From a paper:
The FP can now be fully modeled into the new C3-symmetry map and is almost completely resolved in two out of three protomers of the asymmetric map. Intriguingly, both of the new maps contain additional resolved density for a long and narrow small molecule proximal to the FP in all protomers, although in the asymmetric reconstruction, this is less prominent in the protomer with a less-resolved FP. The refined coordinates of [name] were used to define a ligand binding pocket to conduct in silico virtual screening (VS) and identify other molecules that could potentially bind.
[name] fusion is facilitated by the viral envelope glycoprotein ([name]), a trimer of non-covalently linked heterodimers (gp120 and gp41) (Harrison, 2015; Lee et al., 2016). Binding of the receptor [name] to gp120 triggers a series of conformational changes, including opening of the trimer, exposure of the co-receptor binding sites, and rearrangements of the gp41 helices (Blumenthal et al., 2012; Harrison, 2015; Ozorowski et al., 2017).
Numbering used by the authors:
A (entry chain A): 32 to 126, 196 to 307, 325 to 359, 361 to 395, 397 to 405, 408 to 505
B (entry chain B), D (entry chain M), E (entry chain F): 512 to 548, 563 to 662
C (entry chain C): 1 to 97
Write the structure that this text describes.
């Protein structure tokens, strides 16, 4: 009638763990392009027959802002870039003198390959399959996989490109939606195409070639904001939603940015974020009939690096045509709060922290280890 | 079987099942098991990765089966000891725990005591060995 | 609060610190919770503040666990409580001009 | 050894040997074992196939060694039970079976009773466990 | 653990440690383990070679664990028997052997007697089995 201690082995219990993940990708390895070359000696071929097992009635606490899978992706991408898109001059502080590297800038083809992260033997990845998962709550539909979906390592600010879309609705995720010091990641359930180009007809100016433009469907952009606003309205029900331009700081934050080949496209996004929303409908995007929002873009040679503090110079632009066709799949917004915000909330483009870009894709995954040895009370006794 | 829980070393049951239900399911499956009633490089690469996972699980299994001898539980999936539950570790009854909780919830309920309990189990085994050798004289 | 007094026309360096030296996100806000400066990745950003054309930071020290806010050309209107947010901890320094 | 029978899990003897002869041969070989006294792609492919067969046999072996605990025979190659033979299952004597029949012939002789016998073995183990716990009070 | 000795089946300790020291170290490590507290063809080739070594060690381990049942020591890393030491095999005391010698030195000290001892162990087990079955009547 006494309760006795019983040791059980093979108990289906797991704990959070941090291990080194490996990767896989559909690299071709003969295209000379940077990601295919990197992937050739970094990642393995993908799993020809991946499997996923749904765990019935399992509730798991996920937290996208404490996810160590992010750190590994961050480090792999930095190495990918440093081994490829080499600047002519790399200038960094050393504390505080400067360390300077001078080296060649060959031009290379540069286009992302989706990379799958895979658990090593002894580890497994839990995936949250809820379509409404907000990044930090419990997930009630959890499955086990070895590998993640492939993620293209697109490096950008303000607007997240490519990667993936939400299943049903725009989902707004923030560690603390009210502290004004977190990037709000807005995942869209529909992509908005952005077409950027410099169509081989440029000249040079001196005393241009560094001039390009991007076309955004007007109808899709305005519809997209209306849906974002509806979700923001629910979060902030008595306030006006204002989309404004960026607040200042380094050009990589102030303007959008992306990289095609060696072209860094700093683009003025003011035309996308200049409006005041009343409930879910407004003006400030007049129905002129053009149906094309155009951004002015520049190609720069001296840029601030995203992988650390410092500046770097890249060789001047390609004389032919540059074409990029991307999917806007999400936004990085920050809030303008404060004691004097008398009935309004202002949202501005943010980003610059490449970890936020990677959290927007890795938020559904958690790495765990199995701990099969457990103890529970019983009614049996050992004979002694 | 061995695939329960959707993983090797998930042997005793599905995650999400109660502790009690998992035990009953295990017994039924054990009876059934004893009654007895397209080519690419990536196949090589993943074949090796799959074998490494399986070999490792076997090595860990065998190691733990011998390590548990330190508490007098070697060679077992389910053991039984002579250490009293001590009440304070958990105020729930046998039926409350086994009928309503799953294994993860249970471990969360008592993970502030498992290092203490492991120590007590070792001490009991030492005393049992000592007593037996004293009797054999 | 730490109290630092400057004078109209001067430059003052207010600081936040960390035990960890590198890759630290921090923000500076005023007493009305308006952002002035902050670190996004490796980049310096500015908030919607009256100090945007005067506030700056020595980026080279960020990897030393030192995240200064520098206000150039101080005015009497800048006297306030400045709030550091570094990692999890907060710090407050009062600036008088 | 383990290659007897020309297969893994053919451990107890050569196919075609009598049950008795196989047992004696096994004992002799066990004593000897303890006394202790060209590159092509297909090598990769078949190396993997061979490992898969070996890993699988080990996993099955270990699983069955634990499943048999349901009859009180865990961790054993040769067990011993307290269930009477019941005569009707086979009218042959111990020497007739062990000296003249091989294992396949024997299984053919009694395969109309093994599901019945398996049930009886489980029941005996349950009663044995119950009795021991009743005594320990 | 299992990597002690720098090899599989070096389980009981580092080569060069004394027999006594190795035993104590093993106990400590066992407690810790239970408390729980770049792509080229040659990767394929060596991945297979590594798996073959690991699979083989497991198969040998399991085989020996069952073969030792012939002396009444199946399923064990450390056994205990009822065969007297007989003195002449080694004139050293328990402390002299365990405190100062390593395992290789010990085997060298008595390798003229191990075939004799193995025979004695088998004989004792046979007599023990016989006695138990005679008692059970
Ligand atoms: C989101 O995903 C989409 C697709 O899923 C990505 O879009 C791709 O972006 C790349 C970047 O440009 C683009 O690649 C070009 O395709 C052209 C089709 O034939 C190629 O001709 C071109 O190669 C030339 O330009 C490269 C520039 O660095 C050179 O390195 C290369 O050697 C070639 O250069 C020769 O030709 C040019 C012609 O003007 C000449 O000037 C040079 O001197 C030289 O002679 C690129 O391969 C893809 O086609 C895009 N895909 C689609 C469907 O459009 C998108 O970028 C992702 N988003 C982000 C932000 O990454
Ligand atoms: C909004 O911007 C888009 C650009 O993304 C405009 O679409 C482009 O419109 C031009 C108009 O001439 C199309 O040119 C056509 O190209 C085909 C190619 O073979 C050619 O045969 C035709 O004679 C003509 O030159 C261009 O293809 C088209 N771009 C795409 C991707 O379809 C769009 O028209 C702009 N909207 C408005 C209202 O102007
Ligand atoms: C190919 C890889 C295969 C896996 C190999 C795993 C090897 C790991 C060995 C771990 C040993 C743990 O540590 C040791 O375990 C044995 C297990 O009986 C215990 O031994 C205990 O049981 C045995 C048999 O019941 C008794 O003879 C002994 O008197 C008793 O103390 C020791 O008291 C303990 O110190
Ligand atoms: C890496 C892969 C390794 C292979 C893993 C194989 C796992 C398969 C587990 C099958 C479990 C079968 O089912 C269970 O077995 C244990 C085995 O002791 C039995 O347990 C029985 O023996 C143990 C120890 O002797 C006692 O503590 C228990 O009181 C008694 O009932 C259970 O009564 C039975 O329900
Ligand atoms: C996938 C590969 C896995 C590895 C497989 C290894 C198989 C090797 C089998 C070797 C058998 C050695 O030989 C045999 O062992 C068993 C082990 O209990 C001994 O059996 C002894 O123990 C058992 C259980 O304690 C009793 O039921 C039996 O009465 C007693 O004699 C036999 O007396 C001996 O003849
Ligand atoms: C939990 O998530 C899984 C994964 O999306 C859902 O199962 C999928 O359901 C679709 C429906 O057509 C199938 O096509 C998929 O093959 C299923 N996937 C798997 C892995 O089984 C599942 O239904 C979700 N469960 C709940 C309760 O929402
Ligand atoms: C995600 O949703 C969960 C709810 O499913 C939120 O967690 C709740 O937060 C409120 C805030 O006071 C608490 O009172 C609740 O108890 C929390 N519930 C649970 C189950 O923890 C969570 O904060 C949301 N996360 C994000 C990033 O928005
Ligand atoms: C989210 O951010 C808000 C704003 O900083 C936190 O709430 C503040 O907590 C401090 C703690 O002393 C209070 O003094 C403030 O008055 C609070 N502000 C408001 C507006 O209530 C909030 O706790 C944060 N939430 C989480 C989960 O960290
Ligand atoms: C991006 O959009 C602009 C318009 O906003 C496009 O320029 C127009 O193209 C049509 C096509 O015949 C011309 O008739 C218009 O006069 C152009 N407008 C101007 C102001 O010049 C531009 O071509 C689009 N970009 C791409 C790549 O097609
Ligand atoms: C960017 O270019 C793509 C094509 O590369 C445009 O998509 C095409 O738009 C025309 C417009 O009628 C459709 O008929 C085509 O079927 C579309 N192609 C595909 C593959 O869907 C896209 O609209 C361009 N973006 C913008 C903003 O104009
Ligand atoms: C976008 O943000 C800017 C910066 O705060 C706003 O501009 C300020 O508007 C107030 C309104 O009285 C002026 O007093 C400030 O001087 C303006 N700042 C500057 C630098 O001129 C701007 O109005 C915001 N846009 C929207 C749509 O609200
Ligand atoms: C983005 O483009 C807009 C133009 O649409 C720039 O805004 C202009 O900045 C000049 C600077 O003195 C002002 O005089 C104009 O009145 C502004 N125009 C409007 C419509 O406000 C804007 O600065 C550009 N932003 C970036 C980051 O380049
Ligand atoms: C916000 O930016 C948009 C970018 O399109 C501005 O829209 C243009 O406004 C001018 C004003 O005469 C029109 O001629 C253009 O045709 C509009 N563009 C399009 C694509 O229709 C918009 O006016 C700006 N809003 C505010 C409040 O300044
Ligand atoms: C919509 O406009 C009316 C006009 O007075 C204003 O009162 C109301 O607050 C506005 N709502 C939003 C969300 O801007
Ligand atoms: C979005 O486009 C539709 C097209 O008719 C227009 O009516 C609506 O007002 C637009 N939204 C904004 C914010 O202008
Ligand atoms: C944008 O999303 C659509 C959705 O199917 C996809 O087909 C298209 O290829 C995507 N574009 C890019 C650039 O990935
Ligand atoms: C989940 O709950 C349902 C409710 O009937 C049950 O049938 C199912 O077996 C449960 N799954 C697990 C793992 O217990
Ligand atoms: C466990 O039982 C002992 C018996 O005296 C008691 O002293 C001890 O406090 C109990 N443990 C806890 C956590 O109460
Ligand atoms: C333990 O269970 C008993 C049952 O009546 C209850 O009274 C007691 O308060 C429980 N202890 C705690 C700490 O809840
Ligand atoms: C087959 O029969 C011959 C007859 O002498 C015997 O020697 C041999 O061992 C037998 N083989 C088996 C498997 O018993
Ligand atoms: C087995 O023995 C029982 C003992 O009463 C007997 O009733 C039963 O019929 C026997 N089995 C067969 C197949 O005869
Ligand atoms: C069983 O063996 C005995 C031995 O004399 C024999 O008389 C009897 O007929 C046998 N039973 C059957 C069914 O052959
Ligand atoms: C070798 O001797 C040194 C002497 O202090 C000792 O510390 C070390 O542990 C010894 N190594 C082994 C394997 O015993
Ligand atoms: C072992 O003990 C027996 C006991 O009589 C003895 O006869 C035998 O000689 C001893 N062995 C050796 C090697 O002396
Ligand atoms: C065995 O040890 C004893 C201890 O005194 C010693 O006298 C004897 O000579 C030793 N035997 C041999 C062969 O050395």
């Amino acid at each position: 009638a006494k309760k006795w201690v019983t040791v059980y082995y093979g108990v289906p219990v797991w704990k959070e763990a941090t291990t080194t993940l490996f990767c896989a990708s559909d690299a071709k390895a003969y295209d000379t392009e940077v990601h295919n070359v990197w992937a050739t000696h970094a990642c393995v071929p993908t799993d020809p027959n991946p499997q996923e097992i749904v765990l019935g009635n399992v509730t798991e606490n996920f937290n996208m802002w404490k996810n160590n899978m992010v750190e590994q992706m961050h480090e792999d991408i930095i190495s990918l870039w440093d081994q490829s898109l080499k600047p002519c001059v790399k200038l960094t502080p050393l504390c505080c003198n400067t360390s300077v590297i001078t080296q060649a800038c060959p031009k290379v083809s540069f286009e992302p390959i989706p990379i799958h992260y895979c658990a090593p033997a002894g580890f497994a990845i839990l995936k949250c399959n809820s379509k409404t998962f907000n990044g930090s709550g419990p997930c009630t539909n959890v499955s086990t996989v070895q590998c993640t979906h492939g993620i293209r390592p697109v490096v950008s600010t303000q607007l997240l490109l490519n990667g993936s879309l939400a299943e049903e609705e725009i989902v707004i995720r923030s560690e603390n939606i009210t502290d004004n010091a977190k990037t709000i990641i807005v995942q869209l359930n529909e992509a908005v195409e952005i077409n950027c180009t410099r169509p081989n007809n440029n000249t040079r100016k001196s005393i241009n070639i560094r001039q390009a433009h991007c076309n955004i469907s007007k109808a899709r952009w305005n519809e997209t904001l209306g849906q974002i606003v509806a979700k923001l309205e629910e979060q902030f029900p008595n306030k006006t939603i204002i989309f404004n331009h960026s607040s200042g700081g380094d050009p990589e934050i102030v303007t959008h940015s992306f990289n095609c080949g060696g072209e860094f496209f700093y683009c003025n996004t003011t035309p996308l974020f200049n409006s005041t929303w009343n409930n879910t409908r407004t003006d400030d995007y007049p129905t002129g009939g053009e149906q094309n929002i155009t951004l002015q873009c520049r190609i720069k040679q001296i840029i601030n690096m995203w992988q650390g503090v410092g500046k770097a110079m890249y060789a001047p632009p390609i004389r032919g045509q540059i074409r990029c066709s991307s999917n806007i799949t999400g936004l990085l917004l920050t809030r303008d709060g404060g004691r004097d915000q008398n009935g309004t909330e202002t949202f501005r483009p943010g980003g610059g922290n490449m970890r936020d870009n990677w959290r927007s894709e890795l938020y559904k995954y958690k790495v765990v280890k199995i701990e099969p040895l457990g103890i529970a009370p019983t009614a049996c006794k050992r004979r002694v | 079987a061995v695939g329960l829980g959707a993983f090797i070393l998930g042997f005793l049951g599905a995650a999400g099942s109660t502790m009690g239900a998992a035990s009953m399911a295990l017994t039924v499956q054990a009876r059934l098991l004893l009654s007895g009633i397209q080519h690419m490089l990536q196949l090589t690469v993943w074949g090796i990765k799959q074998l490494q996972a399986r070999v490792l699980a076997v090595e860990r299994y065998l190691r733990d089966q011998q390590l548990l001898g330190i508490w007098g539980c070697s060679g077992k999936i389910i053991c039984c000891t002579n250490v009293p539950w001590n009440d304070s570790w958990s105020n729930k009854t046998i039926n409350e725990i086994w009928d309503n909780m799953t294994w993860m919830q249970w471990e969360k309920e008592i993970d502030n005591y498992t290092q203490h309990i492991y120590t007590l189990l070792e001490v009991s085994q030492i005393q049992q060995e000592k007593n037996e050798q004293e009797l054999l004289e | 609060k730490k109290v630092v007094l400057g004078k109209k026309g001067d430059t003052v360096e207010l600081t936040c610190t960390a035990s960890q030296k590198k890759s630290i996100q921090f923000h500076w806000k005023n007493s009305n919770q308006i952002k002035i400066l902050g670190n996004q990745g490796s980049f310096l950003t500015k908030g919607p503040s009256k100090l945007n054309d005067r506030a700056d930071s020595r980026r080279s020290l960020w990897d030393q666990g030192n995240f200064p806010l520098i206000i150039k050309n101080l005015k009497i209107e800048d006297s306030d409580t400045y709030i550091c947010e570094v990692e999890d901890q907060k710090e407050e320094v009062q600036l008088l001009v």
